[PDB]
Structure formats: structure tokens, C-alpha cells
Symmetry: C3
Subunit: 222 residues, 3 copies
């Protein structure tokens, strides 16, 4: 169960890395090159991480439960790249882009603290990390989306789709966590491993696909 989905994550993220790799090598202009290059490293960072977890690295029993703490070094490096996708397609302001990366790092560090601390101390840091996530939710739903649509007037549904898909996918991460043994213990590690694996595929490979087709939409409108 756990080992199966770890290897599935390796192969899918590897397969993803090859796809974005060749797109970067055969890139149209520089904007396509940047977009293929970002998504490539998002998947390669994920592919090596799942390689480490599949080989039993980065997992240690904490509070009496096998915990893959190394997932947080994946996300700390890959999730800012995923947000750069949004700000790159959107041509976002420097202070608003910095706020998204800063808020993301805050959410992940405090999430790590919640992950490695026992109950009920972890519940405090869970609320701190969710509050940081709800801040990103506002930043993407209001100032980021509004600024991006004004800069891309005849392609507004694209940025509405971008924000929504990112929001619905990322919202499941704190739901899996609080339902995992980290919270109410509704399911065990095997189900937790499959959830994160398929989420990661959706939010990296899947969202990588959505960003490429978004650049196409913004460019076919010119």
C-alpha cells in the first residue's frame, strides 16, 4: 500500500519530468522555456523525494507514528516554484509575488512544526499554518486574480481556472493532514500515502499541464 504508492509517485513524477524536460529543450520562445523549466524542476524535486521515501529515507517514528518529515523539504522547494507558475503567467507585481512566496514558506515551516510536535501542541501550529494558507487564499482570489485579468483582458477565464484549480487542490492537503493520525486518526498511513501521492501528481503534473495550456490561451489571444 504505502510502498506501492511511493513507487507510483516516483514513476509518475519521473514521467512528468521527462515531458517537461523535452518541452524545455524544444521550447518555443523564452516564456515557454521558463514555464517548461519550472514545471520540470517541480517534478524532479518530487521524483527524488518519492525516491527517498520509497527507499525508507526521511521517515522516522514521531509521537508513535511513522512520519515522512522529508515531505516538507519537497514542498518547501517545489511549492514556491508552483506559485511562480501563477505569478509568471500572471505577470504579478514584485510585492504581491513576494507575499505569496513568503506566506507559502510560513505555512510550510509552521506545518512542519505541527507535523513533528505531539498533540495538542500540534493543533496550535496547525491553526497557525491554516491561517497562513487562508491568507494565500485571499491573495490568489482577490489581488492576484484581479491584477492578472487587467493585464490579460480577453483571457479572464484562464486566470479564474488557474486560481480555482490551485485552490481546490491545495485545500485538500490540510484536510488529509487533520484526518490523518496527525489529527483525528480517521485513516492510517497507507491511505495517507495514497492521498498525498495523488494530490502531488494533480498539483505538480496536473497543474503543470494546466499552466502550459494557460500560456497557450494567453498567447493565442495575441
Amino acid at each position: 500500500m504505502t510502498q506501492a504508492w511511493l513507487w507510483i509517485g516516483v514513476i509518475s513524477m519521473a514521467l512528468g519530468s521527462v515531458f517537461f524536460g523535452f518541452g524545455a529543450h524544444n521550447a518555443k520562445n523564452e516564456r515557454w522555456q521558463i514555464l517548461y523549466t519550472l514545471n520540470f524542476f517541480i517534478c524532479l524535486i518530487a521524483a527524488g523525494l518519492y525516491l527517498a521515501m520509497a527507499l525508507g529515507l526521511g521517515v522516522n517514528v514521531i509521537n508513535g507514528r511513522p512520519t515522512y518529515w522529508v515531505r516538507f523539504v519537497d514542498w518547501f522547494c517545489s511549492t514556491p516554484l508552483l506559485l511562480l507558475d501563477l505569478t509568471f503567467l500572471g505577470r504579478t507585481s514584485l510585492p504581491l509575488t513576494g507575499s505569496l512566496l513568503g506566506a507559502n514558506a510560513y505555512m510550510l515551516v509552521t506545518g512542519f512544526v505541527a507535523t513533528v510536535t505531539p498533540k495538542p501542541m500540534s493543533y496550535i501550529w496547525y491553526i497557525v499554518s491554516c491561517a497562513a494558507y487562508l491568507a494565500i487564499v485571499y491573495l490568489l482570489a482577490q489581488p492576484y486574480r484581479i491584477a492578472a485579468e487587467r493585464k490579460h483582458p480577453r483571457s479572464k477565464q484562464a486566470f479564474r481556472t488557474l486560481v480555482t484549480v490551485h485552490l481546490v487542490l491545495w485545500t485538500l492537503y490540510p484536510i488529509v493532514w487533520i484526518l490523518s493520525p496527525e489529527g483525528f486518526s480517521t485513516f492510517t498511513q497507507g491511505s495517507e500515502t495514497m492521498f498525498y501521492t495523488l494530490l502531488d501528481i494533480a498539483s505538480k503534473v496536473g497543474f503543470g499541464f494546466l499552466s502550459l495550456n494557460t500560456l497557450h490561451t494567453l498567447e493565442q489571444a495575441t
Copy 2:
């Protein structure tokens, strides 16, 4: 004593974060947005750090003394943001800005090594970190200030005030350290906790105030 000042640091840095938060949301132009956004994350990074120390996280007895090593992850992330304040208002050269951030990181890493090593080994790394600090002192007192005044001819006292306040506040940090149990043991942890707390408020909330009024001075001169 120690717990009181830890919570005071939480509340003040939280109160600071709200102030810079609303200024960023209601920002004048982009330069005010960047300045409010920087100082917001400086305080939010500090607010979560004091939240962790107040909850007993990030403190471990080393060399026979309770040591808040996690203070160094605060400073490593927040102090470069404080220096960006100076370089942003100053419109500093890229190589001089990089030198300030590079020298700052050097000072903090070697300071961490001095913090977590026993005497007299720590004294070596203290001298290494102070030497890096004296390098920043030169960079801010001579090339940074000179370049900034030339770019802002009718607002030279502002940059003189900026450099001086930053220098006098940051100079107290190595003084508290060497007087703390890390050095001559002139005072205990409770006094050490109050010093760093009020220093952090001065150098983050206080210096955040000074940077906003500096941008106002530079802009009212146009």
C-alpha cells in the same frame, strides 16, 4: 521573567504585523507596497518565532545552559529583509546589496556556531562573527551611505539617520551575547530574554517605522 517577555514579544510583533499588514493592503504605490510588505514579513517571522520559544520550542540546554538556538532561524530569515529595507530605500547597487546580505548570512551562521559550541571554542567563532559585523559596519557607513546620498541629494540626513539607527541597534546584539552566559555570564537567561525581546522590537517594529517615514521624506522631496 523569561516567559513574560516571550509573550510580550509575541503580542508586539503580532501588533506590528497587523500595522504593516494594513499599510500593505492600502498601499499608495508599489514602492510603499514593497516597504509595507517587507516589514510585515519581518514582524510575522519574529511573531511566529517568539510563539515557538514561548511554547518551549527551539530551546535546548547546551553547554549546561538553556539556549534558544531557534532565534538564529528567525534572524537568518528576517535580518536580510531588514537590510533590503536599507538597500530598497537607498536604491543600492546589486554588488553592494549582495555584499550586505552575504556578509549578514556569514555573521549569523558563524554566530550560530559560536552559540552552540562550548568555551573557549565559541570565543573564536564570536570573533569571526564580529569581524563579519564590522565589515557590514563599514559597508553601511561608507559605500552604502555615500551611494545613497548621491542618488538622494536633498535628503542626506535621512540616510544618515537610517544607517546610524541600524548600526546602534545591531551593535547591542553582540554585546548582549558576550555579556550573557555565552560569554562572561554577567546576567542570566531572564535578563537575556528581555534584552533580545526589546532589541527585536526596536530593530523590527521600531526600524520598520523609521523606514516608512524615510520613504516619506525621500518622496516629499519630489
Copy 3:
């Protein structure tokens, strides 16, 4: 043996830091300032690292062998600066520069995992890190060199020399590793310490010299 070469590395990297330090202070224009500043921090990062290893810090027996794991925090911070040298002289595209730094960090993290893991698990992460290095080899031998020569038409041998010297020097690092106790145990720690020390001098002090004379060549061609 080990202690002698550690102190030699301290003094040489210190002597290097002074040379690039004064060149930065007396810099011609900003491009010379950036180049002197980069190489200065490359050597200063190396000088403090060798200071820590010479003082016995950052070395711990793993898998039954004294391992200087702290070498990897040197390289993780200094090697991207060395690659910036190449991209700065070359005026490289943003996506190609990001790919070089991303691939470099990948190689070093997975190399660290190979360093701190036992055999034969380490052999997997060695192959993963070498594959990342061979990717950088392609990036520097084909797209980086081609793009740089087009931007500098009458100075093509300079970029051929830059890429070659970087490639031949960096290729020896995985050779020393696999021949060290980390691999076939062909030599002991003393010889391993001398190799890395003289490699670091070549790839930081030596390559710093080559980059300055390269900027001179590119500029005397104008």
C-alpha cells in the same frame, strides 16, 4: 596530513578572499565589482568552512568512517556562486541560468544523501547525483556555450576555456568520492582531505582568476 591540508585550505582561501576583496573595493565598473564580489564570497565561504573542519567541527563518524558532512554546506552555498560566474560572464538566459543552479542543488543534495547513507544504498544516490552532474555537463557544453559565444562573437575561445576548465575540475569531485572510503576505499581520509583541498583551491581561487581574466578578454574586445 588531514590537519595540515585543512589549515592550508584556510590560509589559501583566506589569501584568496583578500585578493578578491581589494579588487572589489577598487573595482573598475559595476561588472568588475560583481565579479570580484562573487569570487570573494566563494572563498570566504570556503575559508570559514575549512576553519570549522580544521577545528574539528562538522565531522562525524558515519558508517564507521570520519565524514566531513559540513563540506556539503560549503558547496551548496559556494557552488551556485561559481555557476553565477559563468552565467554572468556569459549573459545567460534566465531559464538556462535557473536550470544550472537547480541542477547543481539537485546534485549536491543527492550527493549529501549518498555521503551520509551506507553501502550499497549510497551507490544509488551516487548514480542519481552523477546523472545530475552529467546534465550540467550538457547544459554547459551545449546550450550555455553556444548562447554565450553568439553574444560574444570575437571572444569564443574564452568561453570554450571557461566551460572546459570548470568541467575538468568539477569532474574530479565524483572521482575522488567513489575512490574514497565512500566507494572502493582506494585511499584513506588524509589523501581525501588533500584532494578536496587542492580541488577547492583550483575551482575557487583558480577559477576565480580565470573568470577575471575572461572579463578582461571580453572587454578588451570592445
